[PDB]
Design goal:
The structure is cut from a larger assembly and holds chains A (57 residues), B (40 residues), C (378 residues), D (85 residues), E (241 residues) and F (160 residues).
Chain A: H1 5-17, H2 34-49, H3 51-54
Chain D: H1 5-10, E1 16-18, H2 19-26, H3 32-40, E2 49-51, H4 67-83
Chain F: H1 14-30, H2 35-52, H3 55-76, H4 82-88, H5 94-106, H6 134-158
The chains are: A mainly alpha (57), B mainly alpha (40), C mainly alpha (378), D mainly alpha (85), E mainly alpha (241), F mainly alpha (160).
PDB class: hydrolase
Keywords: ATP-dependent protease, peptide-unfolding channel
Entry title: Nucleotide-driven Triple-state Remodeling of the AAA-ATPase Channel in the Activated Human 26S Proteasome
Chain lengths: 57, 40, 378, 85, 241, 160
């Protein structure tokens, strides 16, 4: 839900960056912070799932 | 492109991809499927 | 002022596929020639139907009386422009002179459409143009003119509201949605139903009910299929008047497959003998089958085709190649065992194959921005 | 190059093919080639028939080991997630 | 004749407001609106509500006409089984006014609607057969009941344990393959029943398992992402050339 | 030559149309297993193929279509008998059908078991591909494809 349902509210902003074109005040950067959060969110889940391969054997 | 030897040598068109499968198979079909009524 | 000539287009398809009656279609065509002053309607029918003998002076004194009625409207252009008024002078040279398109060919059409187009201050007169472009494109099978005028009709007339002629547009594009292939928007624009009531351009509303009910058995899903007819008030009384259509509607919900092959042929008879349904009936046949076969195979995980012979009455080798040609085309993926008389369900689309739309459509997507990334720079 | 394909092509996998049915392709009458097949194939030499036992053949599971290498696949996969990072 | 009944009803639409005061027309038209529209099977509660409106307008009129008015409205409560208006009408002071013989048999019919209970419904079916004849449509009223009351007793037997043999569970409904199991096969289609049968060994298996959660939340967002790049393709080709 | 192709008019252009008409109905005869229809396409439309120089495949494409025809039937049915698929694919004889199915197993095309008496072919549904196996193993190539483009975007970003 944070990796999908948050995507559409994040990926509407590039369609909001399309004006079109161009009557709306620019620039605006919506890239952060969800992108890097979901990155680290996998970094939490990948190395915690490595506990299967790390702890065991 | 146009270099090398490149230059040297809804719609119904979209449905025609599926429609041609009707041409070589089972016609449409009404009459035959309508004849199958009294067959058995 | 359409249906009398709009039925000549019905006579064209009545002459087109069946060759049986050439006299019955030419009598009411000549009856439509002796009235309404039709010229080209019997000229393009003169090649399809019999070449008489003689029409000529019988219908030439008409086109002369037409010319007398054409010249008096062409005399009305410089007689009314002698005075001055807003839109009133040149409004007489559109509706009746584009009624001369109904007389013959495109001469009345093309020259009277653009000649009156710039003056009109009201959207109702601009749509009468678009109207008469839709009838000539119904008469002659050319699909060009009826696509462009509707695009011009949506911009100007919809600005803006109207009750009457705007509901006709939703019928036109809906009729265009069934003229070309669109299932979902056909019945969606037909949702207006009796709000359009009956008009010269709406022909018989009971026939308009037949047009929307035949698309509503595919595009309108089974939960919504029974909903629109039963919960819908104004649409329910007109379907109960027809015992043939209402039967097949409820029998579809009753799931009995014995009455389908009979009643579906009755619908196909109307689908065969109606214009603009000739290219579109081929996929319509087995699309109502898979619609009945969708709920079929969803019922049991293991089903014997001999039990299907009961309902089908009696499918043995018929559904053997039939259901096999459904799977090969991607319609209703299923496993039916041969000579073992078992059908297997499946296919669990809730997990595996449903994931594939992500990367597959995302391949050409990301590929398009790979190549176009190497373009910047150079 | 065709003769050695009678053993290779026809199976795997068929159940049982009768004596004279295999002789129809091999022609001759009762050659030592089919006798050499009874040695080479092995497979089976049945009376008036040939058998594929047992069974069809070797009954592949295939293996319960690949669960190991599946954990090996996650090793470099989680490493690629750390390369970005 | 439904179209002829509505045509006679349509002519009454402008007839009620034609004269000065009906004196009773629209109220009678409401009962007539509870006939054709009820034949249309529009809404069970609204048509039953027109009988309540007519019953409010039936006060101080001929008693034989009023004593047969409860024949239609209280037996209309039989078809619905969920009017929710049960206690409103019959327990009010206006509906308790009739002590006559014919309405006393109707008072227990209004109680028979509160009963349901196919053990009792099949019993009183013979006792009320006289009132069953006065039913305007005898089949449809009790067909929608018997078809609905079918699964009412079926959801009782199938509920307690997950999987059941199809031969004995359909022995209480007296048969299997012809209609029941085909109607039960329609229950998966109507979503009222989640499960699957077994034709060979005769064991009905119920599984609610296979959810759809993560998947449609993924691919459907990517289909929208196809509109992000295609719409950006206009920006791409425009700035470059 | 892949054996899996749809109708190619979805790639057609009004300018390319007139030129692809002899090459159009070709693939329309590939989707079907009829010999009389396939050989008639080679006779009439073989003139257009002379300029392309594509005649190398026409001898091996007959073996390609018979694989598409049997894949259409094998995917549509659990069991498929050799005698019923004999004339349906018009192999006309039981003996060459044993040769085709044998080479079909050699190419990994079909999983069908065969019970030889007359004989007949009795197959079964192939499963266990499931979920935990193929998608996550394929995703190793998907992400390795995607994470490289992250570098491709950085490299393209470093030039400006």
């Amino acid at each position: 839900n944070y990796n999908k349902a948050v995507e559409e509210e994040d990926k509407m902003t590039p369609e909001q960056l399309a004006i079109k074109n161009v009557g709306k005040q620019d620039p605006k950067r919506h890239l952060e912070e969800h992108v890097d959060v979901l990155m680290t969110s996998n970094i939490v889940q990948c190395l915690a799932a490595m506990l299967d391969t790390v702890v065991f054997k | 492109m146009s270099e090398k030897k490149q230059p040297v040598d809804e719609d119904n068109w979209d449905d025609d991809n599926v429609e041609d499968d009707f041409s070589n198979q089972l016609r449409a079909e009404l009459e035959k499927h309508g004849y199958k009524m009294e067959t058995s | 002022p359409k249906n009398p000539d709009l039925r000549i287009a019905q006579l064209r398809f009545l002459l087109s596929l069946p060759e049986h009656r050439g006299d019955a279609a030419v009598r009411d065509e000549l009856m439509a020639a002796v009235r309404d002053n039709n010229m080209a309607p019997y000229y393009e029918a003169l090649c399809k139907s019999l070449d008489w003998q003689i029409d000529v002076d019988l219908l030439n004194k008409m086109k002369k009386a037409n010319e007398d009625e054409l010249k008096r409207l062409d005399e009305e252009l410089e007689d009314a422009e002698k005075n001055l008024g807003e839109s009133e002078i040149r409004d007489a040279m559109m509706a009746k002179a584009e009624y001369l398109c109904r007389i013959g060919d495109k001469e009345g059409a093309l020259t009277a459409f653009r000649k009156t187009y710039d003056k009109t201050v009201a959207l109702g007169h601009r749509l009468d143009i678009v109207f008469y472009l839709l009838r000539i494109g119904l008469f002659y099978m050319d699909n060009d003119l009826i696509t462009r005028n509707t695009e011009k009709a949506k911009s100007l007339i919809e600005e803006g509201g109207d009750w009457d002629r705007r509901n006709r547009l939703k019928v036109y594009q809906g009729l265009y949605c069934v003229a070309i292939r669109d299932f979902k928007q056909a019945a969606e624009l037909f949702l207006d139903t009796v709000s359009t009531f009956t008009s010269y351009e709406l022909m018989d509303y009971k026939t308009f009910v037949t047009y929307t009910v035949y698309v509503s058995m595919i595009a309108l899903e089974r939960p919504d299929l029974r909903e629109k007819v039963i919960k819908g008030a104004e649409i329910l009384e007109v379907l109960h008047s027809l015992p043939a259509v209402r039967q097949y509607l409820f029998s579809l919900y009753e799931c009995r497959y014995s009455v389908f092959f009979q009643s579906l042929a009755v619908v196909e008879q109307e689908m065969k003998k109606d214009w603009l349904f000739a290219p579109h009936y081929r996929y319509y046949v087995r699309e109502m089958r898979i619609h009945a076969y969708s709920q079929l195979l969803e019922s049991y995980r293991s089903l014997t085709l001999g039990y299907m012979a009961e309902a089908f009455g009696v499918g043995v080798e018929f559904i053997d190649q039939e259901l096999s040609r459904f799977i090969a085309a991607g319609r209703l993926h299923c496993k039916i065992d041969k000579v073992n008389e078992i059908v297997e369900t499946n296919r669990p689309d809730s997990k595996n194959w449903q994931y594939q739309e992500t990367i597959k459509k995302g391949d050409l997507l990301l590929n398009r921005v790979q190549k176009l990334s190497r373009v910047i720079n150079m | 190059t065709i003769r050695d394909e009678i053993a290779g092509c026809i199976e795997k996998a068929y159940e049982k093919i009768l004596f004279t049915e295999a002789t129809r392709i091999l022609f001759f009458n009762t050659p030592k080639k089919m006798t050499d097949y009874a040695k080479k194939r092995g497979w089976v030499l049945g009376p008036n028939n040939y058998y594929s036992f047992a069974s069809q053949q070797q009954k592949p599971e295939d293996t319960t080991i690949p669960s190991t290498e599946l954990a090996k696949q996650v090793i470099e996969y989680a490493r690629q997630l750390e390369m970005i990072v | 004749n439904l179209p002829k009944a509505r045509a006679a009803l349509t002519s009454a639409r402008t007839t009620a407001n034609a004269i000065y005061c009906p004196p009773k027309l629209q109220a009678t038209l409401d009962m007539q609106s509870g006939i054709i529209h009820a034949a249309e099977e529009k809404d069970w509660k609204t048509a039953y509500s027109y009988f309540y409106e007519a019953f409010e307008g039936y006060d101080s009129i001929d008693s034989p006409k009023a004593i047969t008015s409860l024949k239609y409205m209280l037996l209309c409560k039989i078809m619905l089984n969920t009017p929710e208006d049960v206690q409103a009408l019959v327990s009010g002071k206006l509906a308790l006014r009739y002590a006559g013989r014919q309405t006393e048999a109707l008072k227990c019919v209004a109680q028979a609607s509160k009963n349901r209970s196919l053990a009792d419904f099949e019993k009183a079916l013979t006792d009320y057969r006289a009132e069953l004849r006065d039913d305007p449509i005898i089949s449809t009223h009790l067909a929608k009941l018997y078809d609905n009351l079918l699964e009412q007793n079926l959801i009782r037997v199938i509920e307690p344990f997950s999987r059941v043999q199809i031969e004995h569970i359909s022995s209480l409904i007296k048969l299997s393959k012809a209609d029941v199991e085909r109607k039960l096969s329609q229950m998966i289609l109507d979503k009222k029943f989640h499960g699957i049968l077994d034709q060979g060994e005769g064991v009905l298996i119920i599984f609610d398992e296979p959810p759809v959660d993560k998947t449609y939340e993924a691919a459907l967002e990517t289909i929208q992402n196809m509109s992000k790049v295609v719409d950006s393709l206009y920006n791409k080709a425009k700035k470059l050339t | 030559l892949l054996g899996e192709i749809p109708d190619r008019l979805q790639f057609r252009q009004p300018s390319l149309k007139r030129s692809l008409m002899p090459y159009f109905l070709l693939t329309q005869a590939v989707r079907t297993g009829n010999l009389a229809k396939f050989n008639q396409v080679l006779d009439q439309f073989g003139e257009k193929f002379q300029a392309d120089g594509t005649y190398t495949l026409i001898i091996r494409l007959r073996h390609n279509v018979i694989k598409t025809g049997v894949r259409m039937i094998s995917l549509s049915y659990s069991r498929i008998s050799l005698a019923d698929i004999a004339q349906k694919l018009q192999l006309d004889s039981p003996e060459d059908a044993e040769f085709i199915v044998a080479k079909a197993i050699r190419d990994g095309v079909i999983e069908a078991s065969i019970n030889h008496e007359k004989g007949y072919v009795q197959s079964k549904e192939m499963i266990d591909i499931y979920s935990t196996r193929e998608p996550q193993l394929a995703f190793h190539q998907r992400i390795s494809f995607c994470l490289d483009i992250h570098n491709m975007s950085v490299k393209a970003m470093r030039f400006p």
